Coordinates of C-alpha atoms and ligand atoms in Angstrom, one line a residue:
X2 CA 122.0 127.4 82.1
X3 CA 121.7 124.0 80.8
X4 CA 119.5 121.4 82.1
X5 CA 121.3 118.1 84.2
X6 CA 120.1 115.0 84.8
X7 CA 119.8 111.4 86.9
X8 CA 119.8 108.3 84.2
X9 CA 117.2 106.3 85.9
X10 CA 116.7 103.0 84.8
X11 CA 114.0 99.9 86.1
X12 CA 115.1 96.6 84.9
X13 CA 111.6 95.0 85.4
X14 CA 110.0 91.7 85.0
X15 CA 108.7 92.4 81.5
X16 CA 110.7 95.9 80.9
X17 CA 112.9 97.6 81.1
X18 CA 111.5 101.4 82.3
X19 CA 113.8 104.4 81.9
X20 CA 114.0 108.2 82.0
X21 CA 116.4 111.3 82.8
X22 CA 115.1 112.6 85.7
X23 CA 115.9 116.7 87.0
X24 CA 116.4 118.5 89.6
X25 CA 112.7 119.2 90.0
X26 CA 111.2 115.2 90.0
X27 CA 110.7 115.6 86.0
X28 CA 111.0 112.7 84.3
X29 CA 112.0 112.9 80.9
X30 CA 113.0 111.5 77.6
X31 CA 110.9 108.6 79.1
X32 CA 111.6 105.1 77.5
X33 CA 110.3 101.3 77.7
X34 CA 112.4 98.2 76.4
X35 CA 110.0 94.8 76.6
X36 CA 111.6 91.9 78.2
X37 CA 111.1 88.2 76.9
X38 CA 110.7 85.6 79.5
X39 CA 111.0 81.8 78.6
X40 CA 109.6 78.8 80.3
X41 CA 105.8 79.1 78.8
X42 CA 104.4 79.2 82.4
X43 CA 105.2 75.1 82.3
X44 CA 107.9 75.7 85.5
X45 CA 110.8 77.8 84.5
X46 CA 110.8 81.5 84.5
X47 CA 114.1 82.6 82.9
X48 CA 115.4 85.1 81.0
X49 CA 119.0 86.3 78.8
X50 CA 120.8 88.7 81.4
X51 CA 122.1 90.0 78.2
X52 CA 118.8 91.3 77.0
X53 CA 119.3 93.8 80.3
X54 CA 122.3 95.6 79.3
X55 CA 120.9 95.6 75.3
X56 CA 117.9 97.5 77.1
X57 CA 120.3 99.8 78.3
X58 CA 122.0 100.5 75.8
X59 CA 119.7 101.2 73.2
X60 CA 118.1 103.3 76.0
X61 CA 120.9 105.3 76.4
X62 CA 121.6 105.3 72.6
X63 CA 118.3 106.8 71.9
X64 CA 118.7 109.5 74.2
X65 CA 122.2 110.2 72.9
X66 CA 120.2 110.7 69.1
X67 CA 117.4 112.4 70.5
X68 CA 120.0 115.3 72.0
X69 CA 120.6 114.5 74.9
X70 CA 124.2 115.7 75.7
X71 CA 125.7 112.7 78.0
X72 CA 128.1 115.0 80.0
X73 CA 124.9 116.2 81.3
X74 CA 123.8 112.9 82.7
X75 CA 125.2 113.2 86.3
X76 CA 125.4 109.8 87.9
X77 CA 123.2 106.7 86.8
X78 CA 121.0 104.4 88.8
X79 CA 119.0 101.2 88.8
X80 CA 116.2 99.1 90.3
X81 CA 114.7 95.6 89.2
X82 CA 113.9 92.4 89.6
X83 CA 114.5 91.3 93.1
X84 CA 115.5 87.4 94.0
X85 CA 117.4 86.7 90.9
X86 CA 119.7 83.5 90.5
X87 CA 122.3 84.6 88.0
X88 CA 125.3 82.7 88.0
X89 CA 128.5 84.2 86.0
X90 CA 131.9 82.9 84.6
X91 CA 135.7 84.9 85.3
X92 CA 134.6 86.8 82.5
X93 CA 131.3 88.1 83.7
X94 CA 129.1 85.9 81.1
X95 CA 126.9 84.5 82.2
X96 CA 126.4 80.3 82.7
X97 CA 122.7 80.1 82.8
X98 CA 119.8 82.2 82.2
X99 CA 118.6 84.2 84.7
X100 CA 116.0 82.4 87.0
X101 CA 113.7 84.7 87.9
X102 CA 111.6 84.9 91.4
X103 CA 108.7 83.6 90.7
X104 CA 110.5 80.1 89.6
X105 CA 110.0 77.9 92.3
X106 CA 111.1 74.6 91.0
X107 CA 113.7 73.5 93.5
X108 CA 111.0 72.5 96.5
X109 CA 113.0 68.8 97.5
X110 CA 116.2 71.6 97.7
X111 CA 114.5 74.0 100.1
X112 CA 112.9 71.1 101.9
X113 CA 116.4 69.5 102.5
X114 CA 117.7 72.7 103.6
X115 CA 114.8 73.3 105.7
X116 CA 115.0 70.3 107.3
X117 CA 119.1 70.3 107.5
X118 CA 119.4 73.4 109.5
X119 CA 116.2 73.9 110.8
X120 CA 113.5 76.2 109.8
X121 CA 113.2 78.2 112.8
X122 CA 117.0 78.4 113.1
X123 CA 117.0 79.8 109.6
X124 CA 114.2 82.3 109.7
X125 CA 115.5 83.4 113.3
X126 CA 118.8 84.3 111.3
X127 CA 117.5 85.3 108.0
X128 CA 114.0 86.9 108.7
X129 CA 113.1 86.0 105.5
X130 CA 111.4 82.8 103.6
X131 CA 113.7 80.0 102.8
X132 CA 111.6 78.6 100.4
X133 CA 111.8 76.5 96.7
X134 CA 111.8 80.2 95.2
X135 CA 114.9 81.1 97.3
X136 CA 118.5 81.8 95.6
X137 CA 120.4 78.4 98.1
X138 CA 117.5 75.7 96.7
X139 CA 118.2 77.3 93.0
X140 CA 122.4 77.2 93.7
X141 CA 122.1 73.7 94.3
X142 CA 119.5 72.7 92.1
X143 CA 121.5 74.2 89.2
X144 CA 125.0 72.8 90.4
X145 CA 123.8 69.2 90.7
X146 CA 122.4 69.6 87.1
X147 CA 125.4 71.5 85.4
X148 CA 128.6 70.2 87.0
X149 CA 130.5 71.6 83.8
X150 CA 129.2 74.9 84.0
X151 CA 129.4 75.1 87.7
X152 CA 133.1 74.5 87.9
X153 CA 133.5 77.7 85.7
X154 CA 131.3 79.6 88.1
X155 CA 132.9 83.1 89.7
X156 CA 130.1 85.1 91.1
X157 CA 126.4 84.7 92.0
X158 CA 124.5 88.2 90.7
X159 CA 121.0 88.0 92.9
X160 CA 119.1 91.0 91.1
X161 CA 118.6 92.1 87.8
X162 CA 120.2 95.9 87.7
X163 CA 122.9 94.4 89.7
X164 CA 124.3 92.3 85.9
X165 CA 123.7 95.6 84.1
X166 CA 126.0 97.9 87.0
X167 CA 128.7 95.0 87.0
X168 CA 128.2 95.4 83.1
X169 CA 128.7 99.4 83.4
X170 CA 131.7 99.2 86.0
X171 CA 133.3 95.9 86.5
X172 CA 132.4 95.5 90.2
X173 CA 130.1 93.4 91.8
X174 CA 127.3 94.6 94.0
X175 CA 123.7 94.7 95.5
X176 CA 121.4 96.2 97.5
X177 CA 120.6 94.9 101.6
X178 CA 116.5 95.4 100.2
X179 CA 117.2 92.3 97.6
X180 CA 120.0 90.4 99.0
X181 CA 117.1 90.0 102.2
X182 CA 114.8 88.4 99.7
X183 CA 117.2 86.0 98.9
X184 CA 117.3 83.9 102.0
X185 CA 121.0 84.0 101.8
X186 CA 121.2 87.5 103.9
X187 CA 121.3 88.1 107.8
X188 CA 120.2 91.0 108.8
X189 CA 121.1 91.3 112.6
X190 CA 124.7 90.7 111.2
X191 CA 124.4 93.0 108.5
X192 CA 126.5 89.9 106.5
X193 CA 125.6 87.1 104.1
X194 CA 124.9 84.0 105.9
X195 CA 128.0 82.7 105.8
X196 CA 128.1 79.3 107.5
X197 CA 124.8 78.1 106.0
X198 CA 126.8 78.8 102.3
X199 CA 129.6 77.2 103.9
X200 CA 127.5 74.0 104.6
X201 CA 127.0 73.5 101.2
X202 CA 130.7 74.2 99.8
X203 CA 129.7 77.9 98.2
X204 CA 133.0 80.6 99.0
X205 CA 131.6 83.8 100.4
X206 CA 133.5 85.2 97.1
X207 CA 131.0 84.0 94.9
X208 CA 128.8 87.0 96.6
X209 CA 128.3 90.7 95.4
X210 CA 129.8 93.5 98.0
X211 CA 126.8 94.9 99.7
X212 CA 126.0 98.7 99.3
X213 CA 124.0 101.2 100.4
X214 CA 121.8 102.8 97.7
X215 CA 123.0 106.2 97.5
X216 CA 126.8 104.7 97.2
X217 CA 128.9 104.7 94.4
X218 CA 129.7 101.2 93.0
X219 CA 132.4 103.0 90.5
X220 CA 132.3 104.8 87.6
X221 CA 131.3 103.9 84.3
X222 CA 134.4 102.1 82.3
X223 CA 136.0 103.3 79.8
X224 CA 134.8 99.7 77.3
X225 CA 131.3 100.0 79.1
X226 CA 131.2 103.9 77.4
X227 CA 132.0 102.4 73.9
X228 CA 129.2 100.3 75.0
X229 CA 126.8 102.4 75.8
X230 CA 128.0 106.3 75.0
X231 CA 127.6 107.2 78.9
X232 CA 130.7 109.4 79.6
X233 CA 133.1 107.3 81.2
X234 CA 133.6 108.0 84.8
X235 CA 130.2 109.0 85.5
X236 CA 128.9 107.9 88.8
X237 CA 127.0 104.1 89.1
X238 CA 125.0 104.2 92.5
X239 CA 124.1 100.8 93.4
X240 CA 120.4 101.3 93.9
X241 CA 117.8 99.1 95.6
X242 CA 115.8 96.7 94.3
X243 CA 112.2 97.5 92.8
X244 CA 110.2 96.9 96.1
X245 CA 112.0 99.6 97.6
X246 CA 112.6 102.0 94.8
X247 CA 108.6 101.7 94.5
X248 CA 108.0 102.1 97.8
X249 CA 110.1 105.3 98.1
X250 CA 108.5 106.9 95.1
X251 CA 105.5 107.1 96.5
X252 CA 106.7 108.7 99.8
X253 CA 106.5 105.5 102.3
X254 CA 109.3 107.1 104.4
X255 CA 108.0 107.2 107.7
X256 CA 107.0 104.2 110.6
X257 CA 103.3 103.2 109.7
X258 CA 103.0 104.6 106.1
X259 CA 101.9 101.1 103.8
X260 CA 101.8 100.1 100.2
X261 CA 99.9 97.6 98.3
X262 CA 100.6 96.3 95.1
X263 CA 96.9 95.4 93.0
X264 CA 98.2 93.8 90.3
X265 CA 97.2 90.3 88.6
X266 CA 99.6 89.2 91.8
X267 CA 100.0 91.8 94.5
X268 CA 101.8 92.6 97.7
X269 CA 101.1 94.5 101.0
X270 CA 103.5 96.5 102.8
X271 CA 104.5 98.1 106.4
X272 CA 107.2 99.9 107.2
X273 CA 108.3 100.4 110.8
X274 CA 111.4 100.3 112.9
X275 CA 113.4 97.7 113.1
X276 CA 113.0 95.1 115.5
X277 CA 113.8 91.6 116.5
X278 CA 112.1 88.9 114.6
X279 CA 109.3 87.0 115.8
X280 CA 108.8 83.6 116.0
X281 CA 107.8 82.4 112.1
X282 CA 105.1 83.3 110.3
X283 CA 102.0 81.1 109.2
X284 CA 101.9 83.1 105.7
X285 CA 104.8 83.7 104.0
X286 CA 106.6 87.3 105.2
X287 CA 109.5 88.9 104.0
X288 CA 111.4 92.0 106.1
X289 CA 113.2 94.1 103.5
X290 CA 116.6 95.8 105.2
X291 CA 118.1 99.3 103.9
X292 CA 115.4 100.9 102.3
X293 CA 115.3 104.0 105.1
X294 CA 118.1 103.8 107.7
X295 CA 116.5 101.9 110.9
X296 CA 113.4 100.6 109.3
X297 CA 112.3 97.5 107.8
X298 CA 109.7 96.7 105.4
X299 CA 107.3 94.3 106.1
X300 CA 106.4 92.3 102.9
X301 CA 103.3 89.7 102.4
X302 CA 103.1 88.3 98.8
X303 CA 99.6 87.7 97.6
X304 CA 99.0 85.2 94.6
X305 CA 95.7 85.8 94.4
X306 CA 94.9 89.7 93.9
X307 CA 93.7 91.2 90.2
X308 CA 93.8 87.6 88.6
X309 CA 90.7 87.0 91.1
X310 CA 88.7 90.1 89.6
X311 CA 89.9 88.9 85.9
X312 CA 88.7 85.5 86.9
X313 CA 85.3 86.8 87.7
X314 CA 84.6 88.3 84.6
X315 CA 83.8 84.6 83.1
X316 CA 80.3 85.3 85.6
X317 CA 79.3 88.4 82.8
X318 CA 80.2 86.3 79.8
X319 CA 83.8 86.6 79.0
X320 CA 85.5 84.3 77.0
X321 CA 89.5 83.1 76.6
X322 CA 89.6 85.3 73.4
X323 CA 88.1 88.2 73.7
X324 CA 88.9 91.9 75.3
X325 CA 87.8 92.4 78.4
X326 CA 87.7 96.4 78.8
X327 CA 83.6 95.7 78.2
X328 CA 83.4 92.9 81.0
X329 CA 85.2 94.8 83.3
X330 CA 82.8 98.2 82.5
X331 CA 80.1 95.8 83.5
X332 CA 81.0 93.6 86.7
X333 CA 81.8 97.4 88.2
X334 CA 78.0 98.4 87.1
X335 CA 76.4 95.2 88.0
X336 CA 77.7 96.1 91.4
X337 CA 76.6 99.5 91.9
X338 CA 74.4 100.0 95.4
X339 CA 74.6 96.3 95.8
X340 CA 75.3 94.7 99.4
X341 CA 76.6 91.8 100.6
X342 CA 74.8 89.0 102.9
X343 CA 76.8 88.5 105.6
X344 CA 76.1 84.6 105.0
X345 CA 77.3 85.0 101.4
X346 CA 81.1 84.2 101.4
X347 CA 83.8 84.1 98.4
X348 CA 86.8 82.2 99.5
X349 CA 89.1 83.7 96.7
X350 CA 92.0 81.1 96.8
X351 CA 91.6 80.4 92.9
X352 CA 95.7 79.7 92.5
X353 CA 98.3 78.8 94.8
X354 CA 98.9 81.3 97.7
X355 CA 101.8 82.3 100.0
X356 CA 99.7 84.9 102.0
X357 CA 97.8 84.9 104.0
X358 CA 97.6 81.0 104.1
X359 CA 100.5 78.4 102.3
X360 CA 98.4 76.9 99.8
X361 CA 99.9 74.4 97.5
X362 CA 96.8 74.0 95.3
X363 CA 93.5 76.0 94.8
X364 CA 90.4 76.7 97.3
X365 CA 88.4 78.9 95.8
X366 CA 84.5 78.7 96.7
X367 CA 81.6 80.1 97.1
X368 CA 79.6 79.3 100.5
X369 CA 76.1 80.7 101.7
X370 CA 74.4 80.7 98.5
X371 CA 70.3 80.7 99.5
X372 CA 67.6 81.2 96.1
X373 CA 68.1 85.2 96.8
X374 CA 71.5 85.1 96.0
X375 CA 71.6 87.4 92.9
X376 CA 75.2 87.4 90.6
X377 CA 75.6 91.2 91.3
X378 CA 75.6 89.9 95.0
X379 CA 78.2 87.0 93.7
X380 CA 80.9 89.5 91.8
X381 CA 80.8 91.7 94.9
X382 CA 81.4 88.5 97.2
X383 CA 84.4 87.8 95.2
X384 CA 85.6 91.4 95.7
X385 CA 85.1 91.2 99.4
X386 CA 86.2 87.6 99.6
X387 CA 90.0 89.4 98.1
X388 CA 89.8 92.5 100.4
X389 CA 89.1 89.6 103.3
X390 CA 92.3 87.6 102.3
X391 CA 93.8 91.3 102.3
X392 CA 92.6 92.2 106.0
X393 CA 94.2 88.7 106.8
X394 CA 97.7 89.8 105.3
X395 CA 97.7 92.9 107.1
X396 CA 96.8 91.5 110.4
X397 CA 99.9 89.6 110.1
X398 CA 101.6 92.5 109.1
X399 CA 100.5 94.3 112.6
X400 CA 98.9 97.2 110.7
X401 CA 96.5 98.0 113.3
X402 CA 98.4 102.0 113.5
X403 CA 98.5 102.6 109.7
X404 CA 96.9 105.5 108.7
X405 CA 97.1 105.2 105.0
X406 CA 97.7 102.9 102.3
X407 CA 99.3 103.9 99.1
X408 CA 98.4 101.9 96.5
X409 CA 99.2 101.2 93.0
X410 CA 98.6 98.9 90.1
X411 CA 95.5 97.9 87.6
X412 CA 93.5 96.2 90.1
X413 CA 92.7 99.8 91.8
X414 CA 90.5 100.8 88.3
X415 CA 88.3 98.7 90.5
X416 CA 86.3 101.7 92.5
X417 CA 84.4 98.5 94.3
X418 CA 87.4 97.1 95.1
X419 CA 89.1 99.6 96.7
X420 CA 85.9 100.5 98.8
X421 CA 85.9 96.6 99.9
X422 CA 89.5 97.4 101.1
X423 CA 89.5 100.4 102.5
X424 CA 86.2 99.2 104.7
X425 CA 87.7 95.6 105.6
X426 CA 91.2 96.9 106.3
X427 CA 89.8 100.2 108.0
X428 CA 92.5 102.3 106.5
X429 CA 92.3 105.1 103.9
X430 CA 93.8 104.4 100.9
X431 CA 95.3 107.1 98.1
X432 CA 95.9 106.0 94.6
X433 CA 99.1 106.9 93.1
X434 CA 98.9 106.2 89.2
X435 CA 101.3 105.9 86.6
X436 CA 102.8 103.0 88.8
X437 CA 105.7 102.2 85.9
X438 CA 107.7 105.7 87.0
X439 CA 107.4 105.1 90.8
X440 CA 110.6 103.2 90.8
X441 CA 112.1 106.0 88.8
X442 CA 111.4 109.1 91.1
X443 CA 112.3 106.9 93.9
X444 CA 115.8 106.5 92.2
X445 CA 115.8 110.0 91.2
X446 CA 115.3 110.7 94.9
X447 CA 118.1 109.1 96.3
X448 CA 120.4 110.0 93.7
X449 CA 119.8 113.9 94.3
X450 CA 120.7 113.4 98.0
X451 CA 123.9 112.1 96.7
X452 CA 124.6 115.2 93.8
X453 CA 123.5 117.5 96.6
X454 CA 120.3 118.4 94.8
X455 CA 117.8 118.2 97.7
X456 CA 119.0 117.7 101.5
X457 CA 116.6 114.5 101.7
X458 CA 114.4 112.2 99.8
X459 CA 111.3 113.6 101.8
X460 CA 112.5 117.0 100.1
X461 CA 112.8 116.0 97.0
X462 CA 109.4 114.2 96.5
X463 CA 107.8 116.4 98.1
X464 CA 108.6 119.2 95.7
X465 CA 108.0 116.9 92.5
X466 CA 104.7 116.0 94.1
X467 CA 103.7 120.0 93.8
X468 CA 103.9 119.9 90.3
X472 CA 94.5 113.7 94.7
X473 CA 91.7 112.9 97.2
X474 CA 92.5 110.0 99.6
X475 CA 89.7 107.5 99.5
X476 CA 88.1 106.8 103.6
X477 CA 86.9 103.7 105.3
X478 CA 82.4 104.1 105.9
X479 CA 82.1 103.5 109.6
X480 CA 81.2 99.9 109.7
X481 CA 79.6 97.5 112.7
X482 CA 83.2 96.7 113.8
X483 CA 82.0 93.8 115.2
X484 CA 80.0 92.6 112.3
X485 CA 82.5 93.1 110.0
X486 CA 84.8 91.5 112.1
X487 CA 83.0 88.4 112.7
X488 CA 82.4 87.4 108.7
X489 CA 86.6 87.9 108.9
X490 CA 86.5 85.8 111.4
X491 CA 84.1 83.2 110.1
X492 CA 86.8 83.7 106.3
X493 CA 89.2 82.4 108.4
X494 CA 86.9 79.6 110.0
X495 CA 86.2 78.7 106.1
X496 CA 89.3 78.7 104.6
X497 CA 90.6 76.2 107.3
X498 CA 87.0 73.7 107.2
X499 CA 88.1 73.9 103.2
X500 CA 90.9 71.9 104.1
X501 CA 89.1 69.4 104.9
Ligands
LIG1 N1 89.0 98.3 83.8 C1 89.5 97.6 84.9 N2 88.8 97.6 86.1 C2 89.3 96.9 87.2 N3 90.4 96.2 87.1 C3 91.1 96.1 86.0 C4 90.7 96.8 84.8 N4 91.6 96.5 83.8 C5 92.5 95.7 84.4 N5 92.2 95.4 85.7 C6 92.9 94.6 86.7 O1 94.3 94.9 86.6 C7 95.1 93.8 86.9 C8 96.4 93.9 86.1 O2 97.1 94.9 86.8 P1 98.6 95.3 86.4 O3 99.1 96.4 87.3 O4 98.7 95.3 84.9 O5 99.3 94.0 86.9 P2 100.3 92.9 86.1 O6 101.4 93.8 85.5 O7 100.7 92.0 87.2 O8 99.4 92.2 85.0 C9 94.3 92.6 86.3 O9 94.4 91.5 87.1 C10 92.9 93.2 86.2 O10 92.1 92.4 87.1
LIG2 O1 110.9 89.0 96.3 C1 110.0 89.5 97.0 C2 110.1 89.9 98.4 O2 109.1 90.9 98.8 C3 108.7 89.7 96.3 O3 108.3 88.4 96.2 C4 107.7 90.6 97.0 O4 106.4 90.1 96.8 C5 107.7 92.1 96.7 O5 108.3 92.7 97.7

C-alpha cells in the first residue's frame, strides 16, 4: 500500500502554512510561504491576493519535486484570513488589494450605516459588529474612491482561501464562520443580508455561494493543474475560516469547551448552542455560525494581550533594538513567589481595545502604588491587570460552565501568566503548542469525514492526539478576588474621566 493524503493549506496573516496530512493526523511534507503586508502600520493593511495562489503553488510544486505523487493527494482544503474585502473584475483579477481585518479606516462609513439602519436593528439581524473594520464601510469606502475600478467590479471574495479555491476551480465561495464576521451575513436566515446590500445599490451577485465546510466547491480545473500540478478533478472543499479551523484542531467540539488566543493580540472563545441574540454588547462580540452543526462560537477580540507582557519588558531594561529572549527570562524570574497587593492595580489598556471595553485611545495605568510597592510586585500587576481584562471578556462571554480553556500562542511561555488566568478566570487551562498546524489538523479532520477516513471529526483527533497536564485554578477567596475585579472595572470607567 501506498500512503494518501489531505492537501491542507492556511492562508494566514503573515503565511501561508501547509502540509499533507494522513489518515492517521500526520502532518507531513510540512511547508511555510511568508506573506508581505503593506500599509507600514500608518492605516492600511493590504496585501496582493496574487501572492496567495503563488504560495500555493510553489507549495504544491515543492511537494510535487520532493516525491510526492499528486494522484495521491485526495481532495484539498483551506483556511485563512477571515474578514477580507477583495473586490474582483469578470475575469477574476483582482481591482484592489486585499484589505485585510485589521484595517479599520472607513469609521464615517460604519458610522453612517450605523446610524442609517440602526445599530440595534443591525446587530439584532447580523449578531455580529458592524463596525469601520466591517466588509459594507470598506465596499463603500473603496467605491466612492475608485469609481473606474468599481464599475468593473464582478464579485466581492470576503476571505483569503476563498481567492485561492475560486483560483483552483472557477467558482465562488465561503464559509458561514467568515461570512458572520463580515457584518454582511444573517444568521437566523441562514442568507446574506440582502436588503441592507440593497440599500446601498450592491446585487446579491456580487456575493460568494455559501458552503458548508466538508462540501465540495468543484474540482480542480484543468488550467488551475497547469497551474499548480494538482491532478485536475481532485476535490476543493470549501473550508472555514482560520478561527474555526483553529478551534476544531484543538478539539473545541462540544457546548462549553473554550479557546484563547495569547498572542501579541488575542481572542477568547465559547462555544455553545445556538441561541437568539441578545440585546448588544458593551465590548465588541462576534458569534461565528457553521463551525459544528447547532453551535455558535462566541468570539471577544482583545487588543491588548502579549503586546502588554512585551511592553513590560521596558521595566527590566529592554530597549527598541535589542532581543528580548533575556528580558523575558527575567520579568518571569523577577516574579517568582511574588504576590500581589490587593490595592496594587495595572489597568492594561496600553492600545486601543474592542474587548472588554471600546476604547478609542489608550488607558493604561498603574493605581495603588504605596513606598512598598516593589517592581517584581509591578510586572506581576501588569500580568494580573491582562488576566483581569481577560475575566472581563469572559464574563461577557457567559463562561461561568466552562471547564477548560485551550489555549494557544506565545503569550502562554508566560508560566505567570497563565497562573494569573487560570486563577482570575477560575478555569483550567491546557496548552496546545505548535499553534501554526492547529488550522491544519482541523482541515484534515473535516476532510477525512468527507473521504470516509474517520466517521467524525471527534474520531479523527482523537486518534492523532494518541500519537499533557492541564494546568488548575489555586482555590482563591472568591470574594476577594472578585472584589479587585470588581474595583478593575470601577477603574477603568473613573479613567475615563
Ligand atoms: N519567552 C517568552 N515568555 C513569555 N512570553 C513571550 C516569550 N516570547 C514571546 N512571548 C510573547 O508572545 C507574544 C507573541 O505571540 P505570537 O503567538 O507570536 O503572536 P503574534 O503572531 O501575534 O506576534 C508576544 O506578545 C510576547 O509577549
Ligand atoms: O474577524 C474576527 C472575528 O472573530 C476576528 O477579529 C476574531 O478576533 C478571531 O475570531
Amino acid at each position: 500500500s501506498l500512503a494518501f493524503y489531505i492537501a491542507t493549506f492556511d492562508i494566514g496573516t503573515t503565511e501561508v502554512k501547509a502540509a499533507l496530512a494522513d489518515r492517521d493526523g500526520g502532518l507531513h511534507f510540512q511547508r511555510s510561504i511568508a506573506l508581505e503586508t503593506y500599509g507600514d502600520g500608518n492605516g492600511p493593511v493590504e496585501q496582493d491576493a496574487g501572492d496567495w495562489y503563488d504560495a500555493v503553488q510553489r507549495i504544491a510544486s515543492s511537494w510535487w519535486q520532493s516525491g510526492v505523487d499528486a494522484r495521491r493527494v485526495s481532495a484539498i482544503v483551506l483556511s485563512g484570513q477571515m474578514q477580507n474585502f477583495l473586490p474582483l473584475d469578470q475575469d477574476h483579477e483582482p481591482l484592489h488589494r486585499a484589505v485585510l481585518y485589521s484595517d479599520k479606516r472607513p469609521l464615517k462609513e460604519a458610522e453612517e450605516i450605523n446610524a442609517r439602519h440602526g445599530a440595534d436593528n443591525l446587530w439584532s439581524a447580523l449578531e455580529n459588529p458592524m463596525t469601520a473594520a466591517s466588509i459594507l464601510p470598506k465596499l463603500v469606502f473603496w467605491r466612492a474612491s475608485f469609481p473606474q475600478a468599481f464599475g468593473r467590479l464582478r464579485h466581492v471574495v470576503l476571505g483569503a482561501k476563498d481567492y485561492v479555491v475560486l483560483r483552483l476551480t472557477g467558482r465562488h465561495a465561503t464559509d458561514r464562520t467568515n461570512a458572520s464576521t463580515t457584518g454582511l451575513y444573517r444568521p437566523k436566515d441562514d442568507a446574506w443580508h440582502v436588503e441592507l446590500l440593497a440599500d446601498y445599490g450592491f446585487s446579491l451577485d456580487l456575493m460568494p455561494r455559501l458552503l458548508e465546510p466538508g462540501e465540495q466547491v468543484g474540482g480542480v480545473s484543468a488550467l488551475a493543474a497547469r497551474q499548480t500540478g494538482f491532478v485536475s478533478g481532485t476535490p476543493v472543499l470549501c473550508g472555514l475560516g482560520d478561527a474555526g479551523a483553529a478551534t476544531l484542531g484543538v478539539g473545541v467540539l462540544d457546548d462549553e469547551d473554550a479557546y484563547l488566543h495569547l498572542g501579541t493580540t488575542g481572542w477568547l472563545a465559547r462555544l455553545t448552542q445556538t441561541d437568539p441574540v441578545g440585546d448588544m454588547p458593551v465590548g465588541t462580540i462576534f458569534r461565528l455560525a457553521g463551525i459544528i452543526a447547532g453551535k455558535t462560537l462566541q468570539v471577544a477580540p482583545v487588543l491588548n494581550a502579549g503586546n502588554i507582557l512585551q511592553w513590560a519588558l521596558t521595566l527590566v531594561g529592554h530597549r527598541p533594538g535589542e532581543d528580548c529572549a533575556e528580558y523575558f527570562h527575567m520579568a518571569a524570574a523577577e516574579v517568582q513567589g511574588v504576590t500581589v497587593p490587593d490595592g496594587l492595580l495595572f489597568v492594561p489598556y496600553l492600545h486601543a481595545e474592542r474587548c472588554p471595553v471600546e476604547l478609542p485611545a489608550p488607558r493604561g495605568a498603574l493605581l495603588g502604588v504605596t513606598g512598598a510597592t516593589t517592581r517584581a510586585q509591578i510586572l506581576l500587576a501588569v500580568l494580573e491587570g491582562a488576566a483581569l481584562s481577560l475575566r472581563w471578556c469572559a464574563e461577557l462571554l457567559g463562561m461561568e460552565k466552562v471547564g477548560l480553556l485551550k489555549v494557544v500562542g506565545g503569550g502562554a511561555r508566560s508560566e505567570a501568566w497563565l497562573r494569573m488566568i487560570a486563577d482570575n478566570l477560575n478555569v483550567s487551562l491546557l496548552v496546545k503548542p505548535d499553534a501554526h498546524l492547529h488550522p491544519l489538523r482541523g482541515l484534515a479532520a473535516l476532510a477525512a469525514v468527507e473521504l470516509e477516513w474517520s466517521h467524525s471529526i471527534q474520531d479523527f483527533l482523537r486518534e492523532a492526539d494518541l500519537r499533557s497536564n492541564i494546568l488548575h485554578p489555586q482555590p482563591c477567596d472568591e470574594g476577594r478576588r472578585r472584589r479587585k475585579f470588581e474595583r478593575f472595572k470601577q477603574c477603568v470607567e473613573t479613567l475615563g474621566r
